[PDB]
């Protein structure tokens, strides 16, 4: 809820960690701006504190300031943080910002580091297909289908991939299964009428 973290800061004015912990608490309690002020303080004390860059980044994500979230996440990564979640948040934010050519290596990594993360794998798929690497996109879309068979979006994006492969067979096949799952998939609907 609150206390502890507050006093831990007192007489420890010099340590970044307690400021980070308090900022983490403030995030979870909807005090986003104040969280940012505490992450700021931590970074003023230790400009290498990866978790402060990461914590601030998530705040930026919630507020949908993606350019600033990219900045924070890449600083986290630069300061040392390397894990599935970070590569994911960075990958995905790089997507929202156009520039897939940049999301690709980090999204690739998130899958590697967690082959079970359906969400990451679907985002990697879309980025691969976007970049021209279309067969490896289908590789990924298929694996998403194996873990989550209720994943209509994957089927649709598979459907769209096959279109760029010049094939009005498997395209309509995969597209069917998307409407099959979600009867109100308007994009799958409009895609099929072509």
Which CATH number is 30's domain given? 1.25.40.10
User: Rounded to an integer, what distance in angstroms lies between the CA atom of residue 123 and that of residue 116?
Assistant: 13
User: Rounded to an integer, what distance in angstroms lies between the CA atom of residue 39 and that of residue 21?
Assistant: 9
Q: Which domain holds residue 113?
A: 1-194
Going by C-alpha positions, the residue among 96, 97, 98, 127 that lies closest to residue 110 is: 127
Alpha-carbon distance values, 194 to 171, 178, 188, 191 (Å): 11, 16, 10, 6
Q: Is the dihedral of CA 41, 93, 181, 134 positive or negative?
A: negative
What contacts 70, CB < 8 A, 6 or more positions away? 90, 93, 94, 97
Alpha-carbon distance values, 145 to 91, 95, 178 (Å): 21, 22, 11
Structural domains counted in the chain: 1
Written as six digits, the tokens of 158 are: 């598979």
């Amino acid at each position: 809820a609150a206390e502890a973290f507050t006093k831990a800061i007192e007489e420890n004015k010099e340590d970044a960690i307690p400021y980070i912990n308090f900022a983490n608490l403030l995030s979870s309690v909807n005090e986003l701006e104040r969280a940012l002020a505490f992450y700021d303080k931590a970074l003023e004390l230790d400009s290498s504190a990866a978790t402060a860059y990461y914590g601030a980044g998530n705040v930026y994500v919630v507020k949908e300031m993606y350019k600033e979230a990219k900045d924070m996440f890449e600083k986290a990564l630069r300061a040392g943080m390397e894990n599935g979640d970070l590569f994911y948040m960075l990958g995905t934010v790089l997507v929202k910002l156009e520039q897939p050519k940049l999301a690709l290596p980090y999204l690739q990594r998130a899958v590697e580091l967690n082959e079970n993360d359906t969400e990451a794998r679907f985002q990697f798929g879309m980025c691969l297909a976007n970049e021209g690497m279309l067969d490896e996109a289908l590789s990924q879309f298929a694996a998403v289908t194996e873990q989550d068979p209720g994943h209509a979006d994957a089927f649709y994006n598979a459907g769209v991939t096959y279109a760029y492969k010049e094939n009005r067979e498997k395209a309509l096949e995969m597209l069917d299964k998307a409407i099959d799952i979600q009867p109100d998939h308007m994009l799958a609907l409009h895609a099929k009428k072509l």
